């Protein structure tokens, strides 16, 4: 705990492997690096000239990829991008052997893919810093971006209130809960009552320990307008998982229909409440997808009849939506992570 | 609104043409650039080498000129200073033709002069960034300096209270009201009741919209000790306009005599209240001008009998006067404006 | 027009949004940059270090992609290439939302895709320079590279004569007509008389305005040998669309069979005539696709029986063929565009 | 003529002290330097770091001053601007003593003033390069800019035709005659017959000899329409010099009234004629001076009724008007002169 906040050589496999001081360091550094770029300081100060990173994506994730690509370039590192065709592991070669080779060529490795265990193998066998760019269990680069954004707005985050509403058991929802614990905030996980029973219990146990240490609290709710009361932040995510069949679509939005973020919910929160969403969001009919949803389920569920789903265009176009600031911050935060971890 | 805060190529003709996010960006950048200079970072990092700006002054304004000259130089730009003899427009050549030529030689143009319309022509016909260095209608570089100063002192400015007292219908007074709207503060425009009827109504309408969006309020007052109550900032300006004849002098100070900032007013405000003034200020008899005023009107108006006018030396020498910090900040703010607008 | 030529911050969505002076400047700047690279001046002089661009391709376009890659790299910019997987706008996210994030990350964006309105959204919502890499409607980077190539060979182009022959209603043919208008050349659009009624009538009106202003003229023709009289340039394009079905395929070559560029045509033109083709071209049976054509057709259509379609190998091997200089100039012209548009 | 072209240490006192090759060299170097600024090559290549120049203006000439200021700064030199209050030679000190001191401080001297003999003394006693910024006798920097502009439009100028029309005996007229001799052009000095008698005879003799060598011709004329036949260039200047007494105005306009440049004249020339004017031009009523003139006269002289004098606004807005390119070129041409003369 009171050793130096030295992150050289560490991997961002899960944020839970880091102290509260280390997490605050990442967030602060991010803000510093953002401020530095606006001054053009990255023109003459490129500390990773001589370094190369590989960024693997076994499923495409363009936001995370672009953030890695601009952050590394700004720092002076070469980046090689390997998409799904080359990122599939454990099939043609053991992930162990792949790891040992990547560690010979590269100074750092990003990986986005399904199995957290894949990340663990990469970390163990490569010997260089590995950065989890999203797995089934966690989205740790996104955490630094999100809480950095809230901090830019409010300053110190302790005892501030955040509601994550919707499919709160998914990787984003769970990632947000971890961030709330590290920042001593009060979280309300607002959605279907039984979702909380699907959250990995080791994660809950660790968050609980963090809340006791840092402040804030964890609470589950079933009531959107209740949850909203006194909230500084309201954070939502998609109800749908592209690639699953009509049944599960129908099922999910059936469970979720009472939890769409609308002006009602915004109005219940504080005046300065900000809205967050990792994007993309479905908040109108300007997508071919919203359309073939407003059309084929606008019957049963009138709530999606205008394309809108997890949030309404009315909320999305208001001054409360900070999702684009939050989007930009994925770059500054990933830059902080790469710098701390590779070192200047 | 939620597009990127990209100011490249924009002109600072009026601050009203900018979003609230853009205005906060300018203020924050200013603070960043100030902090950077104190570290000597401008020695090796001069992003505008290869660029030149022209700074025109059809009436002399040494504070604005020096700020432009040091800010541009620090950035690495050449500057050419054209005073009143060469800055007069529309007489010897159409301002349109002058604009089209300046835009061929220079990467940016500053202009201080009477007609806002002159600024508009420069912006339209030159095609490069134009910076209004003060016109009859507005003093937008001063706005960034002033609110930067308040922010350095208090942090976030929303719902803080500022009183602008005196000739509150003049360009400084109106400029301060715009800044208050962008920062969600409560303004009291404290002076003669009828002055409010001379304020351009399109400006009021826009400020009103900003207050509704950002917070704070607009209120007119006739009572100095009332206005002061709970104020974080008290901002004043000169009662006189050098170059007008004795009549209007006499007239103005007759209308204004009840609104001089004294220890009474300071004491009514909060303990941490700061005093602001764009300078120069008449607050003692150490000017040949205060003297031939304390002498020829000290009779009728005993309030100016010691040279003092808009403020008393007692207030000016107290720890509340931040006008010299505010003065320094004209440079850092103009540097932020030039950098954002020309780009690194 | 009296305005300074300042392309800074501009998007290249359609050449038609530019003045004649701005088009010449791009052509001349490209020639300069080509000369500067041959002297190795790009090693020590790299004006875009600290900038990053995204190049998006919703259909693969290898030639355009490489040009951007080499151009941006020579300038010192980072580039991130996103292919079809990640470039499809409007399905999983509104193009507006995507555009607003792209602009947070990148300093400029290239986009190649079917709908010109996609380019329009990118320009409106990203806030950064956007470059049309080719849409159904127009190919603006190719235009600059084409007329650059012509200028390199002939000097000032006013009143010189160009024949675009074949499917002159397609995007290359239309683009070429636009380019000729900007250069005051005489164009003859040569092929099936019907094809002229398929050209956007707004594009026609604007070209006619440019011909009147700049010189040259517009004519249509049905006879390639009469069209070739006094021609400085003969420019053609493929007869087929890959992916397109047999019927349409067969229909086109029936319509175009009399419009193949052969030595007879070359000789009807001037002695210094040059031949252009944006490439790839089918001018022999060295492609598996030519063979498939000289077989499934070519009894029915003996022109395509040796694999040659729009042009014969005899012309393609002759000193008249400048298509490879035209190809190299994709890079120099795209460099002029990035440099002008981002700025040094 | 066989001597190397080497202008190092030379003064630009009169162009007539220069060979035809030296004048072409300066025009050509002007074009090269223009192309180089557009690619950003002046950021890293500043051959005059360590040099300082003084630019003296006995009467304010804003356009020439800005050209020197920007040209020198691009090259890396410091510049000291001295206005009328400081540039009055021969009154409080001998010009010879002043020149001796200026040579001790500076590496180059610009001087703008009425007496050519003041330039001669600066040249003789300072020992450094001296550049004539404009005297009663000549405007040598303007000559290089002007003929540069013609060359950029036409290429080789030999045997091409220019008309100088109006007060052709003034320093701009005579200067244009000089530049035309050096370029082998056919000049027609068009205006009041008795003007040709006002032109220095040595100058005429020297020009005659240049035409014989280079291939132009000199010719006077009283018919604006006849003179314009087959003209590639029409160049004019103002009829009035601010500020002589009124009597001289109406005397002048009485003499010049038939020589205003109008679209009838433009149309009598070649289609590609270009119009030039060193500016400011009075071509409408957007200047206070125009109005005062359209008022006091305009009864007596109908042409000047709309504010237009030497050129009509209809021509001035035509695509023929190049005066703004001509204005930009003041800078590049002055840059060629400074660089050639101080040396790299």
Residue numbers in the entry:
A (entry chain C), B (entry chain C), C (entry chain A), D (entry chain D): -1 to 342
Could you share sentences copied from the article?
Subsequently, OTC processes citrulline and uptakes inorganic phosphate to generate ornithine and carbamoyl phosphate. Two different crystal forms of the OTC from M.penetrans have been refined. The first one belonged to the P213 space group and was refined to 2.6 Å, and the second one belonged to a P321 space group and was refined to 2.5 Å. Despite the different space groups of the two crystal forms, in both cases an identical dodecameric quaternary structure was observed with an exact 23 point-group symmetry. As with all other known OTCs structures, the monomer consists of two domains of approximately similar size, the carbamoyl phosphate-binding domain (or polar domain, residues 1–150) and the ornithine-binding domain (or equatorial domain, residues 151–320). In all cases the dodecamer structure is formed by the interaction of four homotrimers disposed in a tetrahedral manner. The interface between homotrimers that constitute the dodecameric structure is mainly located at the four 3-fold symmetry axes at the vertices of the tetrahedron. In the M.penetrans OTC dodecamer, this interface forms an intermolecular network of hydrogen bonds between Asn42 and Asn43 from the three monomers, which is unique to the sequence of M.penetrans OTC. Thus, whereas the catalytic patch formed by residues His275, Cys276 and Leu277 does not vary its position between the apo- and the substrate-bound forms in the ornithine-binding domain, the loop between Trp237 and Phe247 displays a different conformation in the apo form of the M.penetrans OTC. Interestingly, this loop constitutes the main binding site for ornithine and is formed by the conserved DxxxSMG motif (between β8 and α10) in all OTC structures, except in our structure of M.penetrans OTC, in which methionine is substituted by leucine.
The arginine deiminase pathway (ADI) is the most widespread anaerobic route for arginine degradation in microorganisms and performs the conversion of arginine to ornithine, ammonia, and CO2, generating one mole of ATP per mole of arginine consumed. The ADI pathway is composed by three catalytic enzymes: arginine deiminase (ADI, EC 3.5.3.6), ornithine carbamoyltransferase (OTC, EC 2.1.3.3) and carbamate kinase (CK, EC 2.7.2.2). Here we have described the structure of the three enzymes that constitute the gene cluster in the ADI pathway in Mycoplasma penetrans (together with the specific membrane-associated arginine permease coded by arcD gene) and compared them to previous structures of the enzymes. In this regard, M. penetrans possesses and expresses the complete set of the ADI pathway genes at the same time while exhibiting a fermentative metabolism.
